Design a protein around this ligand. Structure first.
Ligand SMILES: *[C@@H]1O[C@H](CO)[C@@H](O)[C@H](O)[C@H]1NC(C)=O
Ligand SMILES: *[C@@H]1O[C@H](CO)[C@@H](O)[C@H](O)[C@H]1NC(C)=O
Ligand SMILES: *[C@@H]1O[C@H](CO)[C@@H](O)[C@H](O)[C@H]1NC(C)=O
Lengths: 501, 71, 501, 71, 501, 71
């Protein structure tokens, strides 16, 4: 539920007077909203869960063949028809065998045989569809308040403090309002119906492992398949092997289990948890709008801490440019505001780095209170100062990197989000915006054309075609066709590289 | 990798002679039917890569064959 | 043995000046040799029984994963190493996981996870080698003598009459002189060691069925394999999937059974029979040299039958241009030769067709004796006349086809034999001559390069390459380049079509 | 065929991520190393079929990719 | 704690109005700071101590081999696999040996053997990483007050006289306010986190001698290396030699101790002191800002003594333009300031040289008191007069050199400091200013590319490349490329020469 | 692979400062003295490979440096 320790984490700055912000809550990817005069909140979707799945088709990969029978015909008597054509669950194949006086026939030539075998496959890989009215995204919202290292990721303590909450977003109730204790209220108005295209995926259960597979890919499997709640199997001959034709008896043997072949065929599938006809997905995205009009900063009217603090342990960089440290307050006056700031120089003592934990304060009045505070120091050498005067404590910190490098990293992350989310990426961190809407429309058109043109390619095909298109654009005489060739080739090459393979 | 035709000068049938014709063509036809929009891309690129009709058609065929079977 | 009623049957003619014929015995194929003043024989190889097979490599297509264990390491430190990694029969994989203050770590970053699992194979696909000192061919020779319809295929009665015999051809005994009662003796000098290219095949036993697979294909399987009498496995990562990097416990699950994937990959493999460490394959070829110098004709001392015959049924076309019929002799003249012939018209009586059963006669001295006789009537309307005078019986026969059609069929069959055997086809039915030797040498020279260049292609790619080469040769400038492109394209197209795929 | 990369915008790994790079090139490298005589054929055909160096190299690459994966 | 007697010493003349100055505090160096009125101080870092080192990787340079075993296989039967293929203390290598009927085989050829040996290391070279939370510099600040020749270096007397102090600079406490008896307070705030790039070094312990090695060099060693937690070894084939493939038994030997080879490879490594899991190095630097707002003179309210002084010994040139002498005061008039000055002639007695010991005075009130005084005479001939009248004592001193040579030496030392410290050298003696900031910025911009282009090159390659670039620039046609070629060649030549190799 | 000069800005000596000048030259000197006949090969090849008085010298120096240190 919290944003600490996440490899993927996005920061969004709210402008002055920004009442709301559009977010795209990605699976296993927190986003932290920072605004002026408001507490910083981090909201993330934990899992998408759908119940009452409907079965559509069930392929089977392990078949059993029994009750072998064949009917032989002489070369003149035409084709042979076994009496098991009228019996379902029997697979029959017409074959040609040599017939002569040695085989008991009357003439010499190519006889006709019809070998039938009873097909009954026991282990099936059933695929199920997701009903759009049964999904329920789980979304967690947290506020950076007075927390300890030991209790920052404890959901029970944060709910006891009314600082965090797990709530379920459903198409029936897309909007949820979380009531915090003294931080106000935060309202999320999501779009669960369009968050994940359930019509584009199936829930396929192969063995003990469940996968989320493409609808088109699932229907193209070459295996014996039966519709939901039916024992009528079709394409049964794929799992059955007919041996060398023989007049007296032709042997038919079922192939080995295709469970491993299915697992190899599921290389790009997304594994999901399936239990009690309920599927849980930790991936996906959920477009949502977070409203912070009622979100009020807590502790603004508290006094400053007169007594001294201490650094319990070394601050740790989170990898996102923010630094988390724990402070122990020696005094016991009561709820007081912590005077912690990030400064470039100890003599200058001017605020140069912002605080993720906006308006930190000690909550409990005990003798020693541990407070976790997150700051965003500037690049280069800087000091983390707590208090002033004789009680002042300093902690030097060096932040490797540059603003230019941060800009390049942000551009790369934006490109990756655009590739992963498509048109939904424009909704991320957007407060209205005329540019956002026209950009989203243009990207919708371009993405539709691009998917229609190169949807099914792998990274190898995309990379090779992108290189070819770049080479063609380089040698193209006309500027416009060269420009479009270069653009398409660059997009294809980026997509091929973006898979990190 | 599939075994392929043996070199034993066999006169009877192999393990899978029923699928001998469709063994290699199943993937390509399914990929083309699922994603038919590529046929325009391959044709256009082949037309713009070759200066002769033979070169253009060979480019088109090779592009139509390499995309389904990615390598 | 006998080949009355086989789709594959070859008719060789004995040169007046040659005492031996060099022929290639193929699996499920017959060669009939007809000479002047000599009995007709047909030579056929039954199978090849190689014993004492030596195991080479045993792949595993069904694994089991248990005893799951994992260990995690703090970021910016040494990568984790599980204590079970030293323990044998354990497969370990490295990975990265998000580590922070929540997980008990000290630094926020991508910690290194190392999980190991117990590998145990359930069923394995064993591969074996064929020692060239244990190869053993079963060749059978039959002489067309006094036989009935029911007794023409019984090996017991044919050996009792000393008209047929199955014998083993081994490298240590490459020659066998088959003694025939009153028919002389026929000796065959085969080539067992160079017959089958047994150094290019493995005997793979997957499940309960056994195959004959290539050596270059068997070693390319990406499955856990072990050597002979080796409990330790290698390349075990293929049958294990590491689901998601988790600091506490990363789950590892073994893939499903790969028996179906193996059967799907053994598409062109040749199924064989494996029992008691012995492989028995009925396909393949064996080059042999038949010596008919001492093969004499039986019944040349008997008198002509004086009583009347009868056709026991309508004569049947064998499909190879010959006609098989059974007569019944009502007389009691003892061993007597049957005056059967093929005449063009009933007013000519001059024999125009050739008898396959050279010098037919009645064996038993009792009445109502049945004799099977095979003839080769000419194309068009013909009569099968038996006897002469008032007891003469005739049966009109029509042989469809023409001499040019037979020539085209023979050319096509020879081309198919050349494609299937290669340079060995030139040694089929050739008693010597400079043309055969130079043709075989040229074919070896060309085929070595052809198999080096177009070696492992399927029929579809061979056909495409042939079409492309023909198109390039048509639009070629140099005559020699066009000639060679046309030749190679035609060969490739014929090879693709010859697969009939 | 294989499933291929999902469109769900997943941030964790797919079912088989360790084999993502080698999934489609496993057959091609094994086929090329099994019989390198075709590489001469592809180069010669591409050289004799293309008029420009770009056409020749594209022909060679397309042939070397379309022979191992027969379709 | 003082610069007296140190070859590395730099002087900083503080400008009026500025109350602080930036320092770099190179190891085994010393910075002497003198202001217009404030007393002269010298500050240096004695060492950098880091505790709680964490093991990362342990290489092995001495290993033992025992329990030999060889398993042979017949030719054309695949590579052999010995039963001792288990991971724990067994490493195997494949090889080919001649086989035949003499060896008991069945075929002649290059049979494959697999021999394994027991791997067990005796001595290992553990590598440890430095955690930035545990580094603590030791900075010493001294004030030039009343000191003798024996008590000037005696820290016990100096710290008992409140004229010096050794304090620890930690990231958790980067600011220290040293307390002085009558000289006030001196505050120094440093940058421990960015002082020594501990994230680019390892603490390698080879035998009993410990070094500070680069991370890149340490991980590139081709020796058997284990993980941190004393696990199984890896890359063990480097320390063993497989003598000669023999069918019965192939002997495996262990290479000799690689301790000498490691010492040869540890060429540029910096030896450090290691004890009780704590490292201590006297090298490196630590950027500090010393604040002298509260620094004041001592004994300014004393009246000049009317008694006579005597020169104890001869003045000694310290090698940095300053001379140190000792005066024995013969009076008992209590604490009183020394009327000592440096003059160019004795007919004017106008002070021309600056006194390093600002406002010298006698501390004790004994009969004979020894006072050490440091002066900076002008270049050329000058006198050191103490007092006036008939009790005046003069001491002629000649200072060799010139201000032009002093400027050349200062430029050379600045260039060497810039080469050794890179961008940190721009913050030496800087009280701020816009020239220093832009110079440091452009130096960082150029130095990043310079390191990326010529990082690992040695002085020989640097010198050769600089000579080549100078030759190219001299013969260059365009003046734009000639300038940069000459600049880079000159920098490379200076770097090669600066090593004095 | 040797360590090389460290970037710690040390003012004292490193582990082996006495060999700091001969460490990268002993092998080259010993190799050149062992077989002076190669020096003719390097000079001739540089002279016949460079078309300018500076290119010949650079080629000769590079050839005389590459052979002693085969890496
Ligand atoms: C959260 O805190 C409560 C009370 O201290 C404790 O019982 C519980 O185990 C904690 N949960 C976790 C996950 O640490
Ligand atoms: C062949 O005929 C003999 C003699 O009657 C008999 O014993 C044997 O079983 C027969 N075999 C077959 C296959 O008909
Ligand atoms: C410093 O002076 C004290 C005076 O008792 C003496 O004992 C000590 O040895 C002196 N220090 C040194 C390093 O000589």
């Amino acid at each position: 539920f919290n944003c600490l320790g996440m490899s993927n984490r996005d920061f969004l700055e709210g402008v002055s007077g920004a009442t709301w912000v559009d977010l795209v809550l990605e699976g296993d990817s927190c986003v932290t909203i920072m605004s002026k005069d408001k507490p910083t909140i981090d909201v993330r979707m934990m899992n998408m869960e759908a119940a009452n799945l409907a079965e559509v088709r069930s392929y089977c990969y392990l078949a059993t063949v029994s009750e072998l029978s064949t009917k032989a015909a002489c070369p003149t008597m035409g084709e042979a028809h076994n009496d098991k054509r009228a019996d379902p669950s029997f697979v029959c194949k017409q074959g040609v065998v040599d017939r002569g006086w040695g085989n008991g026939c009357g003439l010499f030539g190519k006889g006709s045989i019809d070998t039938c075998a009873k097909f009954a496959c026991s282990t099936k890989a059933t695929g199920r569809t997701i009903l759009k009215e049964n999904i329920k995204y789980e979304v967690a919202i947290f506020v950076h308040g007075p927390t300890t290292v030991e209790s920052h990721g404890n959901y029970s303590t944060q709910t006891g403090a009314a600082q965090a909450g797990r709530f379920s977003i459903t198409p029936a109730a897309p909007s949820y309002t979380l009531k915090l204790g003294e931080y106000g209220e935060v309202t999320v108005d999501c779009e669960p119906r369009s968050g994940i295209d359930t019509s584009a995926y199936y829930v396929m259960t192969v063995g003990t492992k469940t996968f989320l597979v493409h609808r088109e890919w699932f229907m193209d499997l070459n295996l014996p398949w039966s519709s939901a709640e039916s024992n009528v199997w079709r394409n049964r001959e794929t799992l059955m092997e007919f041996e060398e034709p023989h007049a007296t008896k032709q042997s038919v043997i079922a192939l080995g289990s295709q469970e491993g072949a299915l697992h190899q065929a599921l290389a790009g599938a997304i594994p999901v948890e399936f239990s009690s006809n309920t599927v849980k997905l930790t991936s996906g995205h959920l477009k949502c709008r977070v409203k912070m009009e009622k979100l009020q900063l807590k502790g603004t009217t508290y006094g400053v801490c007169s007594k001294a603090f201490r650094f319990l342990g070394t601050p740790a960089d989170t990898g996102h440019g923010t630094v988390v440290l724990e402070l122990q307050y020696t005094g016991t006056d009561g709820p007081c505001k912590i005077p912690i700031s990030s400064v470039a120089s100890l003599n200058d003592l001017t605020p140069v780095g912002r605080l993720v934990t906006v308006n930190p304060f000690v909550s409990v009045s005990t003798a020693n209170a541990k407070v976790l505070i997150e700051l965003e120091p500037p690049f280069g050498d800087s000091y983390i100062v707590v208090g002033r005067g004789e009680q002042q404590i300093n902690h030097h910190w060096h932040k490797s990197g540059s603003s230019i490098g941060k800009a390049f990293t942000a551009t790369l992350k934006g490109a990756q989000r655009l590739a992963a989310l498509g048109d939904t990426a424009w909704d991320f961190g957007s407060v209205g915006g005329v540019f956002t809407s026209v950009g989203k429309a243009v990207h919708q058109v371009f993405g539709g054309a691009f998917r229609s043109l190169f949807g099914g390619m792998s990274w190898i095909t995309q990379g090779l075609l992108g290189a070819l298109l770049l080479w063609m654009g380089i040698n193209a005489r006309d500027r416009s066709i060269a420009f479009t060739f270069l653009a398409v080739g660059g997009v294809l090459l980026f997509l091929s590289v973006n898979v990190h393979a | 990798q599939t075994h392929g035709e043996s070199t034993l000068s066999n006169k009877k049938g192999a393990w899978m002679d029923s699928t001998k014709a469709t063994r290699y063509l199943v993937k390509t036809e399914s990929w083309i039917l699922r994603n038919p929009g590529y046929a325009l891309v391959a044709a256009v690129i082949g037309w713009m890569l070759g200066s002769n009709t033979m070169q253009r058609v060979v480019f088109t065929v090779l592009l139509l064959l390499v995309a389904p079977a990615y390598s």
